[PDB]
Design a protein around this nucleic acid. Structure first.
Ligand code: NA
Ligand code: NA
Length: 327
DNA sequence: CCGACAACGCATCAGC
DNA sequence: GCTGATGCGA
DNA sequence: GTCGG
């Protein structure tokens, strides 16, 4: 349904969500509001009362009260207040910088550091990650059109194969589900030489080649199994350069790869269903493996998986294209 | 009433 | 120095 | 904040 339906309500709930997350440091309330916003965003009717909204899963007494006030006044007093609150709005704003969470934002604001300008003037008080987040503040809030993700995928697959043609790399996330745009790029990597019972350089070799051809421009974090960094598509001579993008690369054991590709492709809603169904058949499915559940509730050794389909068959389910995994 | 709401890799901190 | 906790991620 | 044992 068009945002026009209950957009006022959902915007309100999302704003409250952010304040709970960034200022109150109540991650669970953050998610409660977001869940409420999502369920309302899907409601194909213009809500007339809080009571109506409450019938939806995730909407309780408090949000129904808030909705009644918003419908009758066109606003929410508590929200109007926190908005004008210079400390709260500043803290909320700073967390938009990658690397700056609620704690760092609160500390910065406590010492007079409230704007990007203030951050820019206090480089010594920012860790490596935060400096990068500051440097690419604008770029990181820009979405990535599918066309660019394809070009990005082109480079990643080419270079990975160039390093070692036995590597297997899959770009997951909504992008794999066919989405029109993405917020970042998530690459899952594996190699036949690496298994749950297996070289501390498989990931490094890949990251290194990507840096060599200048695709990866910065590193936020990097260990033996996970890389989180920055990348940028090459620009055509005399053309506006593409913005820098966030990219994560995970190295996963071969025997857990597909369970990983399944999990990281989502959606989160679909994961919950497939897992809810997995239990019925008596199978435990996590991001790493799928195991059998004994009558006493004891999970046995992980089941061999060599494809995403194997998982579906284990729990008797027709393989559903990532494109149809909306839920 | 009152605990769960995911879990963990990495960077960095806090304590010894 | 080491080990465990915390912040962050999203 | 919401849900549910
Ligand atoms: Na409800
Ligand atoms: Na942040």
């Amino acid at each position: 349904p068009q945002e026009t339906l209950n957009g006022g309500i959902t915007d309100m709930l999302t704003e409250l969500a952010n304040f709970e997350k960034n200022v109150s440091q109540a991650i669970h309330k953050y998610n409660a509001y977001r869940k409420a916003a999502s369920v309302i965003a899907k409601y194909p009717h213009k809500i007339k009362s809080g009571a109506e909204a409450k019938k939806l899963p995730g909407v309780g007494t408090k949000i129904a009260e808030k909705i009644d006030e918003f419908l009758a006044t066109g606003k929410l007093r508590k929200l109007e207040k926190i908005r004008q609150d210079d400390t709260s709005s500043s803290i909320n704003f700073l967390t938009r910088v990658s690397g700056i969470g609620p704690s760092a934002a609160r500390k910065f604001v406590d010492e007079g550091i409230k704007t990007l300008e203030d951050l820019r003037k206090n480089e010594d008080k920012l860790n490596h990650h935060q400096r990068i987040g500051l440097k690419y503040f604008g770029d990181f809030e820009k979405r990535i059109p599918r066309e660019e993700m394809l070009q990005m995928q082109d480079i990643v697959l080419n270079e990975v194969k160039k390093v070692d043609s036995e590597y297997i790399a899959t770009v997951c996330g909504s992008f794999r589900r066919g989405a029109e745009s993405s917020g970042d790029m998530d690459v899952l990597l594996t190699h036949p030489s690496f298994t749950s019972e297996s070289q501390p350089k498989l990931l490094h070799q890949v990251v290194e080649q990507l840096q060599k051809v200048h695709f990866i421009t910065d590193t936020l974090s990097k260990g033996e199994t996970k890389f989180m960094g920055v990348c940028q598509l090459p620009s055509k001579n005399d053309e506006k350069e593409y913005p820098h993008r966030r990219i994560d690369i995970r190295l996963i054991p071969k025997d857990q790869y597909y369970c990983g590709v399944l999990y990281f492709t989502g959606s989160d809603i679909f994961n919950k269903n497939m897992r809810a169904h997995a239990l019925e058949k008596g199978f435990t499915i996590n991001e790493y493996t799928i195991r059998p559940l004994g009558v006493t509730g004891v999970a046995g050794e992980p089941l061999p998986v060599d494809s995403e389909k194997d998982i579906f068959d284990y729990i008797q389910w027709k393989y559903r294209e990532p494109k149809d995994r909306s839920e």
